Design a protein around this nucleic acid. Structure first.
Ligand SMILES: [Mg+2]
Ligand SMILES: [Mg+2]
Ligand SMILES: [Mg+2]
Ligand SMILES: [Mg+2]
Ligand SMILES: [Mg+2]
Ligand SMILES: [Mg+2]
Ligand SMILES: [Mg+2]
Ligand SMILES: [Mg+2]
Ligand SMILES: [Mg+2]
Ligand SMILES: [Mg+2]
Ligand SMILES: [Mg+2]
Ligand SMILES: [Mg+2]
Ligand SMILES: [Mg+2]
Ligand SMILES: [Mg+2]
Ligand SMILES: [Mg+2]
Ligand SMILES: [Mg+2]
Ligand SMILES: [Mg+2]
Ligand SMILES: [Mg+2]
Ligand SMILES: [Mg+2]
Lengths: 139, 179, 55, 257, 125
RNA sequence: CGUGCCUACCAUGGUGACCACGGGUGACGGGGAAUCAGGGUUCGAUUCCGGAGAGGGAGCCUGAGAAACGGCUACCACAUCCAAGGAAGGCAGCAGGCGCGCAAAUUACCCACUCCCGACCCGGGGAGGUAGUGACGAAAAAUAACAAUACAGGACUCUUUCGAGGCCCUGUAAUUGGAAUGAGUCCACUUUAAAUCCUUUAACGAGGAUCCAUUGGAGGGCAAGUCUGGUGCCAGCAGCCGCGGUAAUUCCAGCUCCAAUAGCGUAUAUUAAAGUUGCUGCAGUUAAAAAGCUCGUAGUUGGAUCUUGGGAGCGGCCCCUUGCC
């Protein structure tokens, strides 16, 4: 039961402009609470300071203990658990270091095996964990 | 502020599907036949063909008596005749759509060189067009992916070069050793 | 909560293997040339049922 | 901004100056003169770009201030004195003489007419008025103000003007059946006979023109310059009657070579 | 051995000069210097070598043709007057002898600081 | 200059559900950019047009032209030198520094080009232009091949051939030449204001220590390992599905492969894929969805009906209605 007259462009535009809000992607794109609620301020990366080294549980079909770093942010000031990727790198991270972090696959969701950690460590003291992993430079 | 130029065309298209078994085999046999470098200069030919097809469909869209259709149709036909993809025959627009991919690779530099001799195996023709050993009229050519215009098509003859001109470029080493 | 002791356990306990010498792989044009010649020009004697690109 | 501008960008230059992209940031802004900047032509572009007399811009400043170049019989000291449609350019020490008309495409061209036509210049009447003690005045698009012209000059007429004494001679009026030349709009450089004018009270009248081989255009009154008297041009005109050919006719001409 | 031709030849009696586009041919040797081009053109036009100027050159990718712009002058006064001083500088007729920055600008600011006689003193020495 | 631009008097008006008024913008506006059936959606700080502001905000002289800030006056907030009596300050101009960050270049050279200003052919211009940094991005493009000789891992025209091979593909850390030519090393031209870079040319410059292509990946999606050794729901991998609890096609290593190639992985904004924002072009019995029903203004849509067959002429004109006066 649509509307199809020649003079109905106002009704069509107003109804579409109202019904565009119920999409989740549009409402978190153009409603302010998604930007001013999360960390990173809507940016790709952020620096922070290591607060502590935290091991957390995994889910039930796959049980393990993941290794993460709690981070005071330089920019915003919110505390973040961030996942540290590879086999080592918990040894490569020490207390109170400048750490660059990013997201995983989509910022609204975590990874499957991990409960509530949304963030991935890229660098420690301006050196990547990739270089720290496959014999490259140093801390 | 500054004003020099700002214009940038990508003669280059990434195809959509990354991993297709048929597409990979088709482009691999195309590479192996016409002796190319990598798939970016394969996709050059695909982008040029797609541009000519979009121009051809935009011309076939309009009415026959239209002056823009007549002018741009005759112009595109003259461009294809000067390249050497078409004959001097079928000047309809639909034959342009009848064209395949391999014609541009067939009308490249080194493939026409290999048909006209003095070349000896496409992968060695790659070296012969890079190292200055194959020419065109009076402007010596370095670049492989050259469009041989049909009205020249013949003048491939190269002066002051080691197999035809003369000089001791590295046989000077061997003959100083034979001294 | 759990112990943060074990870290890089497997990569530490992994025995090292000497990275033995490889010949230089041909690059670019020559690589694509042997890619073509390895499977398109002398694999047509073999029959079209089985496939063996690595085993 | 604050007051008048004092520059002009090379990209913001009008199209018909045939200027380049990679050359420089600044276009020559022409001086304030008797012609508008949208219709003018700078002397530095005229000597430098098209005629290939001087490679650099400074050489034009040297020759003009060494007095070689005169406009309408007298020397302009400026390097950027603006020209206009239908102006005399004479050059003294080298026997050469130029006239500014329009190409069929819309551009200025070279037209090497003689000193016999250097003497004679056409111009369009802008408006007419009366001044002190009841004397008449005529105003030219070339910003000539001349008193006691004639009583029988309509507003949109053409006066042949002399550059010796600056006094008028042998006017020509505006009438159905006169040969005119277009100076503006999208159809400039078109030469044809005035067919039919429509007069509106909405301040903008239209004129339909035909030429040889019967092709017809239409334009507005300020874009119109009457050039002849009943299909007879007063002034010699370059490239035939300056008819615009066709895209296809240009292609066939260049194929005929 | 080398061949100089003139393509495009402008007459300019406004400046008392003659301009030409110069094609220098090369089946052999490298790009010919300023001397021998000048002598070969001065012989083929039969005038004096100290008055013909030439500038600007490309190379068309393997032997080939180098294209230049050549000024032919009649008189030395017209040569000195119609040329830019940087093209005088190849023949040494014009010099400024110390082309440094901060000299003109620091003289400007020291003259903008003080006034009059001591201004002339510091700005002249 | 025209005007509620301001004064005085008088009238009581003006706008709005066709979205007024009021908030928000991580909003300067356009010409444009990205995105490919078509239709759109998302940006447009930024080289062109136009507007605004020089720490906030106010006032003003000169001048045709300013509420100018590389002009002035006071306040506020900073901040310099002080002999403590006072002086000068305004980089969101060019380089450069501190801070801020995820995030950004040398205190260079020149008025030679472009044009601009002044009394003026000559002065001056961090406006500009040239060089240095520059994997923002783009174009073209070697990276050791190349034809060889020989051994054949052996395919192919076909003869009992257990091979003629005037074709061949490829492994030859096998030899041989072209010792092809380039990157670098440097003379000399040119280039340019002065150099530089490119091109040109001379002299060197390759036999695997060469003059060395990496980035990711190999269960499915998704091209490519049911190879080997460790590891034992631990470590860890994996964007999802999932793997790992003593044989792991998935962890860690080696070997062999796969894909793109001097550019690949990653994070994020955003477009198509998404006919999962649907006007073209979606649904509404049961999956999410037809208001409890009805009246009703604004909106939206609204039956039919009023000028026709012909004629002249070939192979567009007049009327029997065809522009009236
Ligand atoms: Mg997810
Ligand atoms: Mg301004
Ligand atoms: Mg009042
Ligand atoms: Mg804002
Ligand atoms: Mg598109
Ligand atoms: Mg579109
Ligand atoms: Mg602006
Ligand atoms: Mg202002
Ligand atoms: Mg200013
Ligand atoms: Mg400042
Ligand atoms: Mg990996
Ligand atoms: Mg593996
Ligand atoms: Mg597969
Ligand atoms: Mg991943
Ligand atoms: Mg649906
Ligand atoms: Mg239910
Ligand atoms: Mg339901
Ligand atoms: Mg109603
Ligand atoms: Mg009706």
């Amino acid at each position: 039961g649509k509307c199809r007259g020649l003079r109905t462009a106002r009704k069509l535009r107003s109804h579409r402009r109202d019904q565009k809000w119920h999409d989740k992607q549009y409402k978190k794109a153009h409603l302010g609470t998604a930007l001013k609620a999360n960390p990173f301020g809507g940016a790709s990366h952020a620096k922070g300071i290591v607060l502590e080294k935290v091991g957390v549980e995994a889910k039930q079909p796959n049980s393990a203990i993941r290794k993460c770093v709690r981070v005071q942010l330089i920019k915003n000031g919110k505390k973040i658990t961030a996942f540290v990727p590879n086999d080592g790198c918990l040894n490569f991270i020490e207390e109170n270091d400048e750490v660059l972090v990013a997201g995983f696959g989509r910022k609204g969701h975590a990874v499957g095996d991990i409960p509530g950690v949304r963030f991935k460590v890229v660098k420690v003291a301006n050196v990547s964990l990739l270089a720290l992993y496959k014999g490259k430079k140093e801390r | 502020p500054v004003a020099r130029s700002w214009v940038c065309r990508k003669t280059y298209v990434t195809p959509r599907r990354p991993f297709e078994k048929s597409r990979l085999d088709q482009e691999l046999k195309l590479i192996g036949e016409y002796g190319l470098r990598n798939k970016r200069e394969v996709w050059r030919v695909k982008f040029t063909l797609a541009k000519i097809r979009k121009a051809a469909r935009e011309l076939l869209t309009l009415d026959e008596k239209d002056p823009r259709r007549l002018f741009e149709g005759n112009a595109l036909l003259r461009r294809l005749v000067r390249i050497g993809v078409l004959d001097e025959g079928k000047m309809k627009l639909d034959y342009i759509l009848g064209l395949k991919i391999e014609d541009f690779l067939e009308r490249r530099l080194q493939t026409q060189v290999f048909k006209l001799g003095l070349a000896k195996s496409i992968h060695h023709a790659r070296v012969l067009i890079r190292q200055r050993h194959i020419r065109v009229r009076k402007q010596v050519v370095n670049i492989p992916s050259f469009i041989v215009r049909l009205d020249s098509q013949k003048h491939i003859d190269f002066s002051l070069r080691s197999p035809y001109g003369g000089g001791r470029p590295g046989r000077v080493k061997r003959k100083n050793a034979k001294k | 909560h759990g112990s943060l002791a074990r870290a890089g356990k497997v990569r530490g306990q992994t025995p090292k293997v000497a990275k033995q010498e490889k010949k230089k792989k041909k690059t670019g044009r020559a690589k694509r040339r042997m890619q073509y010649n390895r499977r398109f020009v002398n694999v047509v004697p073999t029959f079209g049922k089985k496939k063996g690109p690595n085993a | 901004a604050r007051g008048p501008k004092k520059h002009l960008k090379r990209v913001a230059a009008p199209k018909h100056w045939m200027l380049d992209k990679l050359t420089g940031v600044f276009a020559p802004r022409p001086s304030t003169g008797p012609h508008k900047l949208r219709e003018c032509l700078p002397l530095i572009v005229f000597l430098r770009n098209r005629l290939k007399y001087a490679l650099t811009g400074d050489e034009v400043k040297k020759i003009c201030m060494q007095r070689f170049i005169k406009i309408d019989g007298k020397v302009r000291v400026d390097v950027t004195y603006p020209a206009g449609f239908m102006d005399v350019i004479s050059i003294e020490k080298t026997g050469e003489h130029f006239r500014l008309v329009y190409d069929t495409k819309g551009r200025f061209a070279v037209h090497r007419i003689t000193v016999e036509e250097a003497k004679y210049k056409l111009c369009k009447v802008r408006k007419i008025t009366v001044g002190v003690k009841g004397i008449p005045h005529l105003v030219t698009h070339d910003a000539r103000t001349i008193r006691y012209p004639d009583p029988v000059i309509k507003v949109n007429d053409t006066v042949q003007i002399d550059l010796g004494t600056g006094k008028i001679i042998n006017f020509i009026k505006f009438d159905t059946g006169n040969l005119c030349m277009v100076i503006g709009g999208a159809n400039l450089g078109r030469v044809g006979v005035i067919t039919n004018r429509e007069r509106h009270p909405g301040s903008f009248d239209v004129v339909h023109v035909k030429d040889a081989n019967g092709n017809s255009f239409a334009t507005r009154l300020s874009n119109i310059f009457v050039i002849g008297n009943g299909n007879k041009p007063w002034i010699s005109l370059p490239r035939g009657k300056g008819i615009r050919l066709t895209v296809a006719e240009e292609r066939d001409k260049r194929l005929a070579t | 051995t080398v061949t100089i031709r003139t393509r495009k030849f402008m007459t300019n009696r406004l400046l008392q000069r003659k301009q030409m586009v110069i094609d220098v041919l090369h089946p052999g040797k490298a790009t010919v210097p300023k001397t021998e081009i000048r002598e070969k053109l001065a012989k083929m036009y039969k005038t004096t070598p100290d008055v013909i100027f030439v500038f600007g050159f490309r190379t068309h990718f393997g032997g080939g043709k180098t294209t230049g712009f050549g000024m032919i002058y009649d008189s030395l006064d017209y040569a000195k007057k119609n040329e830019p001083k940087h093209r005088l500088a190849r023949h040494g007729l014009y010099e400024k002898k110390k082309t440094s920055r901060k000299q003109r600008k620091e003289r400007k600011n020291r003259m903008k600081k003080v006034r009059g006689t001591a201004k002339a003193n510091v700005g002249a020495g």
